[PDB]
Ligand binder design. Structure first.
Ligand code: NAP
Ligand code: NAP
Lengths: 239, 239
């Protein structure tokens, strides 16, 4: 089992914390060559070093701030990747901003715009930049991260709900365009023990939640060979 | 029938052309006091004058460019409305930008951002500004405009599909927050004979399409009293 992802090159955004960190570390343990994207340099250095402890292979990391990056910035990142890696076998878009959790009448419009910029616009721009590398895979897998409020909007979820709906739509468009070329799917992690969840639910007991490690089976499956015919779908990590 | 919307004050965005123009004119014919929002001053003047021909009542219009308006701009507009109108009984968010219809790899990121800004962000900001007026209605009705690609993403629909998914999500959040206070719903017009449709489908015969006038029954129903218990739903004008 331990070589499930041997010779698969997988890029993970939001790899500096929470679910993305766990995904990057888990993929590396299963033999993948991982590329870490994040915003916080110190956190990325820490994750890369912990992957080196666990696997003896030190992954490369890149800084890309999704709030402010331009299309040119994403293209430049892709060019830097091309120098060291001949393809991408997987891209996991896990980075996300929660924004305000409060009624629509109280949503801060600057924060609303930021949520849309990171979760949707920059996620799209990065996708555009990385598509040529993904198409070089024998069976590239592109994964977006949704939420239950990306399937059914609920009170107080504001920009986050709008952005995760947009994410499902973007995934569906891409799956349709890349039939028999790429697998394109969404994962809904479910409520998971991270800082984002704790901010969204400040009074909930985090010990009642599954951890990122607990929800990894779906993350592995989508990057492995058993999911090869599956595209255009949204999967719940906690069904 | 001709006084169905007597003493209902209804604001319509994108009232300068296409479906929005038809909705504004139709609501006025049924007795509504209509407020026209658009970008093109000459078109708004023309629609207001044609409403005056048809009803002998000249509606007010306001310019608000959804690409560049700030939250402050929307608040200022709401203040201007408050001067002349004590409430809003309906708000129809019909304005929209199509953006590029082409594969994801060819989508222009500036255009993508514009589509998200008009269809989602400024639509949200305007909603925030108008909510207090809507809450003054005995039964306020807030209507967003979706598309079939806001329910199922398809190839080439890019930012537009993402934005209409976000629109469905925003509608669902609002419906949940305003239970037994407002009706909040989406209309999917279906393929309708307008300039937007003709650009999206340049080779299609527009005479094969229903016109905006043809799809008005649903637009009237959502503003009239027979839809009073209906919220959180998306309705197809062409089922
Ligand atoms: N935890 C849950 O219950 C839950 C449920 C449903 C969906 N999700 C989704 O799961 C994904 C991961 O979230 P999480 O719970 O693991 O939260 P998290 O621990 O706070 O991690 C979020 C990650 O996103 C990155 N990120 C945020 N803003 C960024 C920006 N401007 N530029 C680049 N990267 C940015 C962060 O990077 P830096 O630390 O380097 O700033 C961090 O690595 C998100 O898409 C979230 O919506 C989580
Ligand atoms: N026609 C269809 O087959 C179809 C199908 C599904 C959904 N829809 C939806 O129906 C709605 C109406 O579209 P339509 O077909 O009637 O197209 P249309 O004739 O081109 O009308 C679009 C309206 O949106 C307004 N608008 C565009 N950009 C704006 C901006 N930056 N600021 C303020 N207003 C702006 C335009 O105003 P100005 O003219 O003043 O610039 C125009 O009044 C849209 O939401 C569209 O997505 C249409």
């Amino acid at each position: 089992k331990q070589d499930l992802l041997n010779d698969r090159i997988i890029l993970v955004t939001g790899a500096s914390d929470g679910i993305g960190r766990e995904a990057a570390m888990t993929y590396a343990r299963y033999g993948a060559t991982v590329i870490l994207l994040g915003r916080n340099e110190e956190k990325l250095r820490q994750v890369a070093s912990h992957i080196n402890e666990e696997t003896g292979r030190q992954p490369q990391w890149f800084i890309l701030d999704l709030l402010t990056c331009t299309s040119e910035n994403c293209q430049q990142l892709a060019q830097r990747i091309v120098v060291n890696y001949p393809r991408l076998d997987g891209v996991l878009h896990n980075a996300g901003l929660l924004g305000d959790v409060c009624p629509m009448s109280e949503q801060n419009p600057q924060v609303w715009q930021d949520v849309m910029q990171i979760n949707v616009n920059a996620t799209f721009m990065l996708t555009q930049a990385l598509l040529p590398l993904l198409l070089k895979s024998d069976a590239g897998s592109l994964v977006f991260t949704s939420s239950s409020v990306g399937r059914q909007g609920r009170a107080n979820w504001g920009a986050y709900a709008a952005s995760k709906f947009a994410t499902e739509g973007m995934m569906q468009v891409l799956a349709d365009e890349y039939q028999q070329r790429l697998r394109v799917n969404c994962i809904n992690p479910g409520g998971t023990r991270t800082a984002m969840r704790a901010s969204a639910f400040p009074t909930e007991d985090p010990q009642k939640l599954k951890t990122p490690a607990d929800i990894m089976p779906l993350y592995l499956w989508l990057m492995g060979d058993d999911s090869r015919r599956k595209t255009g779908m949204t999967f719940d990590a906690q069904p």
